[PDB]
Amino acid sequence: ARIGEVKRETKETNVSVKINLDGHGVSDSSTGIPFLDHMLDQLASHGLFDVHVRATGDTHIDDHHTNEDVALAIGTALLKALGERKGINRFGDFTAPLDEALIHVSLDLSGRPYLGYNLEIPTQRVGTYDTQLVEHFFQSLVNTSGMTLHIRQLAGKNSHHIIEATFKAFARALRQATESDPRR
Amino acid sequence: ARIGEVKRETKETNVSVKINLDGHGVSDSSTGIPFLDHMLDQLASHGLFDVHVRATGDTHIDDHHTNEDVALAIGTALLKALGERKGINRFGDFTAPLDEALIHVSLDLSGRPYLGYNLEIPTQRVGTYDTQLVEHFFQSLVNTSGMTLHIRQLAGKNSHHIIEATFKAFARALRQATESDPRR
Amino acid sequence: ARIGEVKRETKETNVSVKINLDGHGVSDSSTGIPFLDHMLDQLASHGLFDVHVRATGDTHIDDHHTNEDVALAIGTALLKALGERKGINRFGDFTAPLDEALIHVSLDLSGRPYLGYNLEIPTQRVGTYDTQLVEHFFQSLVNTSGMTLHIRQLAGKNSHHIIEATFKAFARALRQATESDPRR
Amino acid sequence: ARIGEVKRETKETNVSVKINLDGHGVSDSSTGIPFLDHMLDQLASHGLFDVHVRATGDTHIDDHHTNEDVALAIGTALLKALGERKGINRFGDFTAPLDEALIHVSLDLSGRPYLGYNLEIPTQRVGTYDTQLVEHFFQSLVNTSGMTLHIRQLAGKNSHHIIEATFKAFARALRQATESDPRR
Amino acid sequence: ARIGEVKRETKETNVSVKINLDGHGVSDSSTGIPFLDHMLDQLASHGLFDVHVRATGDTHIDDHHTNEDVALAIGTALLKALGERKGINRFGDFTAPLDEALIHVSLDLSGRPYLGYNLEIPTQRVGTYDTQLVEHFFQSLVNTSGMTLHIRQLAGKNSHHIIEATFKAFARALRQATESDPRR
Amino acid sequence: ARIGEVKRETKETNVSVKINLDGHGVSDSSTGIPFLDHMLDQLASHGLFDVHVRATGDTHIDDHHTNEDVALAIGTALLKALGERKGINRFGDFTAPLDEALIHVSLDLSGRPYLGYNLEIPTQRVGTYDTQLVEHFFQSLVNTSGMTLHIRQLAGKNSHHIIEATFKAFARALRQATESDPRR
Ligand SMILES: [Cl-]
Ligand SMILES: [Cl-]
Ligand SMILES: [Mn+2]
Ligand SMILES: [Mn+2]
Ligand SMILES: [Mn+2]
Ligand SMILES: [Mn+2]
Ligand SMILES: [Mn+2]
Ligand SMILES: [Mn+2]
Ligand SMILES: [Mn+2]
Ligand SMILES: [Mn+2]
Ligand SMILES: [Mn+2]
Ligand SMILES: [Mn+2]
Ligand SMILES: [Mn+2]
Ligand SMILES: [Mn+2]
Secondary structure, eight states: OOEEEEEEEOSSEEEEEEEETTOOOOEEEEOSOHHHHHHHHHHHHHHTOEEEEEEEEOTTTOSHHHHHHHHHHHHHHHHHHHTTOTTBOOEEEEEEEETTEEEEEEEEOOSSOEEEEOOOOSSSEETTEETHHHHHHHHHHHHHHTOEEEEEEEEOOSHHHHHHHHHHHHHHHHHHHHSBOTTO | OOEEEEEEEOSSEEEEEEEETTOOOOEEEEOSOHHHHHHHHHHHHHHTOEEEEEEEEOTTTOSHHHHHHHHHHHHHHHHHHHTTOTTBOOEEEEEEEETTEEEEEEEEOOSSOEEEEOOOOSSSEETTEETHHHHHHHHHHHHHHTOEEEEEEEEOOSHHHHHHHHHHHHHHHHHHHHSBOTTO | OOEEEEEEEOSSEEEEEEEETTOOOOEEEEOSOHHHHHHHHHHHHHHTOEEEEEEEEOTTTOSHHHHHHHHHHHHHHHHHHHTTOTTBOOEEEEEEEETTEEEEEEEEOOSSOEEEEOOOOSSSEETTEETHHHHHHHHHHHHHHTOEEEEEEEEOOSHHHHHHHHHHHHHHHHHHHHSBOTTO | OOEEEEEEEOSSEEEEEEEETTOOOOEEEEOSOHHHHHHHHHHHHHHTOEEEEEEEEOTTTOSHHHHHHHHHHHHHHHHHHHTTOTTBOOEEEEEEEETTEEEEEEEEOOSSOEEEEOOOOSSSEETTEETHHHHHHHHHHHHHHTOEEEEEEEEOOSHHHHHHHHHHHHHHHHHHHHSBOTTO | OOEEEEEEEOSSEEEEEEEETTOOOOEEEEOSOHHHHHHHHHHHHHHTOEEEEEEEEOTTTOSHHHHHHHHHHHHHHHHHHHTTOTTBOOEEEEEEEETTEEEEEEEEOOSSOEEEEOOOOSSSEETTEETHHHHHHHHHHHHHHTOEEEEEEEEOOSHHHHHHHHHHHHHHHHHHHHSBOTTO | OOEEEEEEEOSSEEEEEEEETTOOOOEEEEOSOHHHHHHHHHHHHHHTOEEEEEEEEOTTTOSHHHHHHHHHHHHHHHHHHHTTOTTBOOEEEEEEEETTEEEEEEEEOOSSOEEEEOOOOSSSEETTEETHHHHHHHHHHHHHHTOEEEEEEEEOOSHHHHHHHHHHHHHHHHHHHHSBOTTO
16 A cells, blocks of 8 residues: 655644555544534545544644645655655546536646646635635645646536535545556 | 436326436437437446436426426436435536537536536537537436536537537536446 | 557658557557657657557658658547547547646547647648648548547647647647447 | 448338439438428439338337438448449538528538537428437438438528528439549 | 520519620620620620510619619529520639639539629729629629529739629620530 | 749849740749749649749848849749730639638739739738738739739738748639630
């Protein structure tokens, strides 16, 4: 099994991540941001990744630093887990709904960071989670993983549905990309 | 094999449906609506479903009641055939052409009915079939199956091509969703 | 292995093509048009086709006749390699990025030629290659192969990225379409 | 005399075509689509082709499959009749009226299929014939004959006049293209 | 030779017309309207018709009645000359320039009168000739000959050029239509 | 046979032209501009002219002077070959396609130079040939031949197709104009 682990401490946050690319969907995420924990559970269940995350940090300032540092660490953990990338599909492409929401994700484990993102989340807070932080989560993850990632909102009105459908589609695309190509 | 069967009688229609999710594309549909029979044949052949349908009803009023009651029964038959949904992909996503027509279908066997539909069929009758009835077929099927279904017209000009490409894409997406996930 | 071979001589060009549908990505293309050679290498590597091409011709007039005659011959070679089409997926659908570029390709090995193409390539020359020739390459290939092909630009700014992403997506869609359907 | 004959059977249609390029306008067409029979009579009379067509098929679904399969077979019959194309004009260009309708047709027996078509037929049914099927007739004929064909509506309001003028102009252009060039 | 002759007297005009369809371009027209005489000379020379016209009438009121009655008589003379129409092309199509002017004429000797006319003559008088009378000349000729006639201005700025190019194109189209079809 | 020959030397260019109006399509053109050579070959083959051209000149400055001086000399050669114009059609009118391109040419060998030209060539270079030079070629040819020439782009997207279709249509119109009128 391909397992990547990262521990990172700043003056703002303390983060530990462990991801198994060849998992069974074991979800074990506690970031101090409940909505992000919910999305990381989606990542595990829809991607069949095992996801272990612990974070503490300066959430009294806002969720930003924690969200960013968790994302950065996940990207690095993914990079480590991938190793030499031998024999993998490398590309993933999936479009997933959640009720009225429909989100397309296309990615390439390319070594060149890029985020294309056009979500229009119509409310500012989902629970206590600042919806600007969704883009920053994916941007930071891309930057440390060296992923080419396109996220396209095809439909959606409920903010929780839009974000959750994004994580479902991303997880399924990433599962595809990380799985073995039977002809390689 | 996962087989669902439904018999339903109203004062307007008499309907019998049997669907095998694990079929070989056996097509055996006679609804009293020839264009709908043609589309149900597409469902079987493109989905590798075995599809048996018989309907009679008040087509002298219009095809509406028959079309609706057939769709409702198909949705219920699908629901029955699925049973506990164990180990299935659950999600399907396919884009199929028919010449100049190009139709994207994304679905989730979620238990929550939703239809997203944006087809713009530029003629009122294909053969003797009222083209408004395409949307109603999918809406009714969604309602009894508890499916999340998005149908997106990406291209198309000929009405028969648009509708037929929709059924090809839907069938292929539904095949995917109903098939076993090798890691589940 | 399914191998198609075509030799074609005009007063303008001399072309030889050999394609293995069941290949390992062996790339061996020399057309007299370096950018086209680069794209044919992408076809091989991303499609797992073995691609052997030799062409000479009137490139001092412009690359047009060579580009066209190579494309025509590739389409015929594909047609020959496919034979009776027994047991194949027939349909392919893939969306691939290259950095900021994102290209969707959907195809059906239908026997009816059709090209849907909406690329907007913002420069006139990539290297010494006239970017109008990309459309003509796909049109000519479609015409002799009898393929239904839709190419959709979803994002992109760099001309080389747009064209190369197109070839990646086309190759992956064509691989899918030509591969065996495990239930057929 | 240059005679081409085609017999083609599908699960949808049974078609037989025989065309003499060097005819006297003998019209003998029975397709199961009366309006199409009327247009094929125009082809014979205005083109001085001898045209023999028989078709049966699934017209209870709609006229589409019959219309398409007849057109495909006519294109192949034309291709066969043309043989090596020695000494022919190859190009045809004619503009014909029918009362207020005025239709320009330009064609080249090039070996490269292309349809340019801009008819705007303002009603959905002429008799029982779906007017979308006019474009599909010419597209399918082009595809199997390998013809470059441009059809331009210059004037017209009555749907029957527009379609019939198209067939008159096409027939006269095709007569020209297929006739001997006295200097070749 | 096919010769038609008409004499017609009203309280406004006295008209005599003789036209030979199989002529040598003999021009012999004196209508009392010099510009119309010039156009009738063009008809003869460009059409290879022999044209004999004499008219007198109420030109002190305006040229209208003479222009109309001459046109009516020419249409009848053409009708008479045509006789049974056996073996003729029947259709004519020609586009002729005169310097910057370019005029397309398409006609069918159909037995159903129709004029399609879109000339935009930018001055009110050419010499002493009222330029509204050009349309009325063709309308009246169509009405008595039973001709389908389309006149299309493709280019032009000088009024004399526009009108004269119209007569050149009409004459050449009419020559074609009235000539023998070698296969009929 | 009607043969015109012109030799012309400037400080910029050396040009020799010989054209046979009553030719067999013998193509023998070497101008120092490969794309122009290709178009002159089209002139010969589509017009059944014999075309002999030799030019050298200052192509390191740009192709302009050579293109212009070749065109001027061709116009003069045509003028010389025509002689007294006895018995010729004088007018030509043809519309030719090349795939998606469709070009109408109408001309009159009038003795009055005029070019009407509306081509919109969407790229700046076809091969190494500056596409502005197409208009200048026809303008210069018109000026020395004393031709009335209208060139109308009816359709087209590929620059090579647009230009080549223009030369096909021009050649066929010029063949018509230069041929004998059987009634003159
Ligand atoms: Cl899309
Ligand atoms: Cl036009
Ligand atoms: Mn930040
Ligand atoms: Mn949720
Ligand atoms: Mn209803
Ligand atoms: Mn069908
Ligand atoms: Mn080409
Ligand atoms: Mn590259
Ligand atoms: Mn069709
Ligand atoms: Mn009719
Ligand atoms: Mn009046
Ligand atoms: Mn004049
Ligand atoms: Mn100049
Ligand atoms: Mn060429």
